[PDB]
């Protein structure tokens, strides 16, 4: 849910256990909005191929998790 | 569609007297038999 009313996007996670004991949260959500309730929790967000380790700072609070796991590789040209 | 529609199976149920022939099925069976004969039959399925 983008629109301010109805928001924000929420997904079920193993949050409380992570908060108690530093066990990273392997998310395959990528469309869950980051919340104030998880800043300083270690997330392992899916990238299509491999799960990506991220520590959620206070600057990330508005954004989605998938925004920090870049799916495509950085393009180059083989100059032949 | 309507999943309960008459099939060839039923055309034996409704009219046992008439020995019907499903042609496509028969053809398939003949093909299978031919495959078996010439060593191109399906391999036996694993169970485990």
């Amino acid at each position: 849910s983008r629109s301010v009313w109805k928001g924000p996007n929420i997904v079920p996670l193993p949050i409380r256990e992570a908060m108690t004991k530093g066990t990273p949260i392997r998310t395959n959500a990528r469309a869950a909005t980051i919340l104030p309730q998880f800043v300083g929790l270690k997330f392992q967000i899916h990238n299509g191929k491999e799960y990506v380790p991220i520590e959620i700072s206070e600057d990330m609070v508005g954004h989605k998790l998938g925004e920090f796991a870049p799916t495509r590789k950085r393009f180059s040209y083989t100059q032949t | 569609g309507n999943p309960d529609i008459l099939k060839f199976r039923h055309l034996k149920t409704l009219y046992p007297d008439i020995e019907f022939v499903d042609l496509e099925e028969q053809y398939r069976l003949s093909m299978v038999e031919a495959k078996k004969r010439r060593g191109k039959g399906a391999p036996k399925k694993m169970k485990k």
Binding site: - | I5, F8, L11, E19, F20, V21, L23
Partner: protein, 50 residues
């Protein structure tokens, strides 16, 4: 209602196949008399199908 009409024409098409299947008989695995049939024509009056 065009949905209903579509459903009816589907049914008709399915019945045609069934009829085709029926048309071929067997006689104790001796003779297989294949009765040829035309494509069916389905007449949908308000009262009755024919």
């Amino acid at each position: 209602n065009k949905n209903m009409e579509i459903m009816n024409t589907m049914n008709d098409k399915l019945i045609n196949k069934l009829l085709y299947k029926m048309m071929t008989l067997k006689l104790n695995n001796m003779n297989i008399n294949k009765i040829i049939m035309s494509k069916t024509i389905n007449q949908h009056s308000l009262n009755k199908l024919n």
